[PDB]
Write a protein that binds this ligand. Structure first.
Ligand SMILES: [Br-]
Ligand SMILES: [Br-]
Ligand SMILES: [Br-]
Ligand SMILES: [Br-]
Ligand SMILES: [Br-]
Ligand SMILES: [Br-]
Ligand SMILES: [Br-]
Lengths: 62, 55
């Protein structure tokens, strides 16, 4: 019943730790930062889904 | 350092969430579980190293 609390907090915390990049520099840099941000967001997605499926609401799911 | 301890706790919990796979099985099934697990680890490394730098 305590793993559930960590799980909800971790997920919360995961998304907050990935703010969008500040627009600055050349087109090439700005594109580079946005590509990396997107990669990180997807990673945060799969991680979260894994956590939800393990510790939370999706864990009851067949 | 309240917020910092919180962060490290969540990260620790995160590593906790990716236990190594049971080793038993064919070399093929073992190679696949290991590959997938390796991927999860890297994701976690990114996040954590990312949070270290930015927190
Ligand atoms: Br916590
Ligand atoms: Br941008
Ligand atoms: Br660049
Ligand atoms: Br690109
Ligand atoms: Br066994
Ligand atoms: Br680190
Ligand atoms: Br650093």
């Amino acid at each position: 019943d305590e793993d559930s609390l960590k799980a909800v907090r971790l997920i919360k915390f995961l998304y907050q730790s990935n703010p969008p990049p500040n627009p600055e520099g050349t087109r090439q840099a700005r594109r580079n930062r946005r590509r990396r941000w997107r990669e990180r967001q997807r990673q945060i997605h799969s991680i979260s889904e894994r956590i939800r499926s393990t510790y939370l609401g999706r864990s009851a799911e067949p």
